[PDB]
Amino acid sequence: APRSVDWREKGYVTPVKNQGQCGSCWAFSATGALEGQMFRKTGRLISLSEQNLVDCSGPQGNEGCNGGLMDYAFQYVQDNGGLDSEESYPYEATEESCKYNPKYSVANDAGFVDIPKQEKALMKAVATVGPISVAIDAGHESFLFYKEGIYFEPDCSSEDMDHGVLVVGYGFESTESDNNKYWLVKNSWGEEWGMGGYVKMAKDRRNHCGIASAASYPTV
Ligand SMILES: *[C@@H](C(=O)N[C@H](C(=O)N1CCC[C@H]1C(=O)OC)[C@@H](C)CC)[C@H](O)C(=O)NCCC
């Protein structure tokens, strides 16, 4: 596999969004992965509606601001036959009744692929597919205050993920401890958090924070 990957440089990644005070991380993770696979197919990068997922994918198992799963979001897009653009169905950070309008649908998918629960398989997926939806343990103050560098949290769990984000690449940089490898992760807490909204999460450190345990992407 390549030693460094960054899908932002290939145009697969929209700007950082902000989920506000709603537990809708899963919706931003899913739109991020579908944005990348739609661009892979069509060469047009179109921001997708998280509100559409939050309001409408309950029948697939999602619970709006009370949490969800990216895979359920991908199943909703396939079941529904579409997903509206962000511009047409703007984000409101609260669950409302479903207002999907097929006329403004700009994305589709045909299923999704779950990645084996190893960082080696995640790396191969990131290298060959595009941005990947993943779930992490983001429940530590260290993660709130992250500013730069490779994020490593000794108390991070690889089994209890609470946060859906998007791996857009990986790479390396020299460090004091010589744990040099990172996943390049897009968060949904706005551009003020972290490095312009991104975090470098420790890679190849025993599936740190569970980043490889629930990874998937939509098939377009
Ligand atoms: C994922 C989720 O939304 N996470 C949630 C979160 O990001 N916020 C809660 C309110 C505003 C943000 C925040 O922390 O801003 C600083 C918390 C619980 C993360 C620490 C959602 O709970 C979910 O569906 N998780 C399951 C895995 C996809």
Question: How many CA atoms lie within 13 Å of 71's alpha carbon, on the beta-carbon side?
Answer: 9
Q: How far is CA 127 from CA 4, 50, 63, 182, in A?
A: 9, 26, 31, 14
Residue nearest to atom 28 of ligand 1 (CA): 164
216 near 114, Cβ under 8 Å? yes
Residue nearest to atom 23 of ligand 1 (CA): 67
Cα Dmax for the chain: 54
144 near 162, Cβ under 8 Å? no
Q: How far apart are CA 211 and CA 197, in angstroms?
A: 17
Indicate if 25 belongs to the active site. Answer: yes
The response to whether 114 counts as a known ligand-binding position is yes
Indicate if 163 belongs to the active site. Answer: yes
Q: In terms of DSSP bridges, do strands 150-151 and 198-202 run parallel, antiparallel, or are they unpaired?
A: parallel
How was it solved?
A: X-ray
Q: Measuring CA to CA, which residue among 41, 44, 39 is closest to residue 7?
A: 39
Phi, psi dihedral angles at 7 (to 5 degrees): -70, -15
Q: How far apart are CA 53 and CA 11, in angstroms?
A: 23
| Eight-class DSSP state of 23 | B
- What are the structural domains, with CATH classification, of the chain? 5-219 (3.90.70.10)
CA angle 30, 108, 120 (to 5 degrees): 45
Retrieve residue 173's tokens.
Answer: 């940089």
The response to whether 50 counts as a known ligand-binding position is yes
Q: How far apart are CA 159 and CA 169, in angstroms?
A: 22
Q: How far apart are CA 30 and CA 165, in angstroms?
A: 8
Q: Resolution in A for the shown PDB structure?
A: 1.8
Indicate if 98 belongs to the active site. Answer: no
The response to whether 95 counts as a known ligand-binding position is no
Q: How far apart are CA 157 and CA 208, in angstroms?
A: 7
The response to whether 92 counts as a known ligand-binding position is yes
What is the CB < 6 Å shell around ligand 1? 19, 21, 23-26, 67-69, 135, 138-139, 161-164, 189
- Span between the terminal Cα atoms of the chain, in Å: 23
Provide the 10 A C-beta neighbour count for residue 69. Answer: 21
The Å distance, Cα 189 to ligand 1 centre, comes to 9
Pocket test for ligand 1, best of 162, 185, 193, 213 (most atoms within 8 A of CB): 162
Active-site residue identified among 52, 62, 80, 187: 187
Q: How far apart are CA 5 and CA 132, in angstroms?
A: 12
Q: How far apart are CA 215 and CA 8, in angstroms?
A: 19
